[PDB]
Amino acid sequence: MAFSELLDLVGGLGRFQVLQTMALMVSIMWLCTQSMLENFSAAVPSHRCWAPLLDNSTAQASILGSLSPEALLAISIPPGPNQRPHQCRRFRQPQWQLLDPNATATSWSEADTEPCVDGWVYDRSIFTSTIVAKWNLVCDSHALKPMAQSIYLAGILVGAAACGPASDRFGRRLVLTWSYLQMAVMGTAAAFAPAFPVYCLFRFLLAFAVAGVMMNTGTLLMEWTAARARPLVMTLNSLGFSFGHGLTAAVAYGVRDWTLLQLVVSVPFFLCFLYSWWLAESARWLLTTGRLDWGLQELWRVAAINGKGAVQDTLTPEVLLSAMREELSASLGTLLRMPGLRFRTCISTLCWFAFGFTFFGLALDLQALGSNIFLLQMFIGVVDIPAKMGALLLLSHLGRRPTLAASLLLAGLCILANTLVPHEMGALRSALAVLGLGGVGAAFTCITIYSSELFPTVLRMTAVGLGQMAASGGAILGPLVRLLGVHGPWLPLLVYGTVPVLSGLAALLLPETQSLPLPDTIQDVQNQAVKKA
């Protein structure tokens, strides 16, 4: 007996599936808020050295001559790039001669400057407080922000590496519930963190739980949803990220203190943990692992919730044990040791890498459209939505492989086409970038579904976990390839364009799905391979 007939008996569509889909989409939305928080909480405000004559009322009172704040700024801080105050240098002594209109802006020497010994004054008009303002992550410490992002993404990688095998061994509900609890507690502790390294530690452990939530949410959605409804529910889950982006912009717009923002974003996950006790674990995994009694209890619970109580008399434990007795009659190394699965795993991980690579590769044009980070994040979410819906329709009509390939090809072609557009002729760059990012979102929906369908239940979470680590590896490598950008302006765009085209071409080397039974066992994958011949 396959799981599909058991699901049809219990009712593979109903109030249970709707409630689980909405609850998990809401949790994915808040997880997105946790993921982009550092886009906002670690924004770098405009800053200058602290200067006595500007910022110490007592030193201002010692001047018998009134000066305007602009004059005090000119005399206290050298002009930096774009005629703004220099972010990293001050005058050792105030150069009052620079207020005289008969003076060139170069009438001073580097010997007249010293570092900001007394710290920095941050502009608080937009953000009341940031981690950058809290720990002075500017100038010499400017590298700590992308370092914090790299630590977070390494947390995602380690989370995927641990939570994959843990999900395969212990079950999806248990790992999901603990991931919600760990994320909620550690994120609250991050909100109350005294020092930046402690903040980085809590952010790493939060990202570990973020990986656990993302994987187990996707797994539960595919395993409880009937095959006909599976694309729609997975698309809704993928739209959860785009709505999470819009929610992120709205919440950060209302609460501009990073501590309060971290708290407001962490508190809903305690409620998510509390209702997450109500979620059903995957019946399919329970059946393939021989845990018939627990699988039965969960199937009866879902049948009761679906109003199909009359199926209780036909589902006896003897019939189920006999049916799995007939069907029956892990470690990443198992995935890499089995020849038919090795190639599929490698190509899936390559497509995940291409996703992570392409997002940060194309994320430079969005900067050209304007300034309000809240509006820009919202517009990213808004344009990400119809691309995902179109992807879902093409996934329903054309299947998983050509839609994924077309999305990766479109992304790579958009970045390469962006290479030929002159820098002066803007807006065309923005249009191509928005279409590109929409294609990347479509590619994300395609690769999440197709990766979830390619691998058998016993190995599915380990393979999805490996994919997620590869995606985080790409995300980590992106910015560093921008550091490779110093060795000529064409190298980063060439790499960011070549990775997704090559990944889409490699993605064409995959077996077509959407009309195959979902693989429960490794043996199911072999039967698909023999049928492919």
Curated annotation (Swiss-Prot):
PROSITE patterns to which the protein is assigned, alphabetical: MFS
Subcellular location as annotated: Apical cell membrane
Sequence intervals crossing the membrane: 9-29, 146-166, 174-194, 195-215, 232-252, 260-280, 346-366, 373-393, 402-422, 430-450, 461-481, 490-510
Alphabetized UniProt keyword annotations: Cell membrane, Disease variant, Glycoprotein, Ion transport, Membrane, Phosphoprotein, Transmembrane, Transmembrane helix, Transport
Expressed in which tissues: Detected in kidney (at protein level). Detected in fetal and adult kidney. Detected in epithelial cells of proximal tubules in renal cortex.
Membrane-topology descriptor: Multi-pass membrane protein
Effect of residue 138 to M: In RHUC1; strongly reduced urate transport
SUPFAM superfamilies reported for this sequence: MFS general substrate transporter
MF terms (GO), sorted A to Z: PDZ domain binding; urate transmembrane transporter activity
Phenotype for residue 297 to E: In some gout patients; uncertain significance
Reactions catalysed, as given in the entry: urate(out) + (S)-lactate(in) = urate(in) + (S)-lactate(out); nicotinate(in) + urate(out) = nicotinate(out) + urate(in); urate(out) + n chloride(in) = urate(in) + n chloride(out); orotate(out) + nicotinate(in) = orotate(in) + nicotinate(out)
Maturation and modification: N-glycosylated.
Residues carrying sugar: 56, 102
Pfam families (alphabetical): MFS_1 (PF07690)
Biological process terms in GO annotation: cellular homeostasis; cellular response to insulin stimulus; monoatomic ion transport; organic anion transport; renal urate salt excretion; response to xenobiotic stimulus; urate metabolic process; urate transport
Disease: Hypouricemia renal 1: A disorder characterized by impaired uric acid reabsorption at the apical membrane of proximal renal tubule cells, and high urinary urate excretion. Patients often appear asymptomatic, but may be subject to exercise-induced acute renal failure, chronic renal dysfunction and nephrolithiasis.
PANTHER family: SOLUTE CARRIER FAMILY 22 MEMBER (PTHR24064)
Assembly: Interacts with PDZK1.
The protein, known as: Solute carrier family 22 member 12
Protein species of origin: Homo sapiens (Human)
Lineage: Eukaryota, Metazoa, Chordata, Craniata, Vertebrata
Gene: SLC22A12
